[PDB]
């Protein structure tokens, strides 16, 4: 007889912040909602706790396979497809042109990280909690944490090199 395992999958919670509201949306990922026991079936899984609409807007919380979600308005969680922007085509001919007559000067910020927090972990105090019986069998493992001390120094010599 064909042995199939019964229906299982991941459970994710789609929710806004606690200072805004408290409603959730349970997503049974990989599970159809005919086999689970105001509902909508997606490709990633059937969604419980969201009102599906036909219009598409700019969303914030992604779900999967094009379906996205946001908290809008007497307020509940809605779900729709991900909008790819406003459609505005440009005309074309063989003898016309479009010349700009004005401009604008804007400042756009760009943030790139360079360095990080240099740490250093010793083998005597982290492994042994001020223990003398721990240190005698620490020498039997050879040179594990001597190589981790060279790796943590090799990270920290690159951090002031990056500056």
């Amino acid at each position: 007889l064909d042995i199939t395992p019964c229906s299982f999958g991941g459970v994710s919670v789609i929710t806004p912040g606690t200072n805004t509201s408290n409603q959730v949306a349970v997503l049974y990922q990989g599970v159809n909602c005919t086999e689970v026991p105001n509902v909508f079936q997606t490709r990633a899984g059937c969604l419980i706790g969201a009102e599906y609409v036909n219009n598409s807007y700019e969303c914030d919380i992604p779900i999967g396979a094009g379906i996205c979600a946001s908290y809008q308005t007497s307020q509940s969680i809605i779900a729709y497809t991900m909008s790819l922007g406003a459609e505005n085509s440009v005309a074309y001919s063989n003898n016309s042109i479009a010349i700009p007559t004005n401009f604008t000067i804007s400042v756009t910020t760009e943030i790139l990280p360079v360095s990080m927090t240099k740490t250093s972990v010793d083998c005597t105090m982290y492994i042994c909690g001020d223990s003398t019986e721990c240190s005698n069998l620490l020498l039997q493992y050879g040179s594990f944490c001597t190589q981790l001390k060279r790796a943590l120094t090799g990270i920290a010599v690159e951090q002031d090199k990056n500056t």
Binding site: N95, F103, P113
Partner: peptide, 23 residues
Amino acid sequence: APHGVVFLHVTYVPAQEKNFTTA
């Protein structure tokens, strides 16, 4: 900035346009 550099990029963007003919 702490652990990074924040860049202020000045750019040139056209805003208003007008259609003409060309050859």
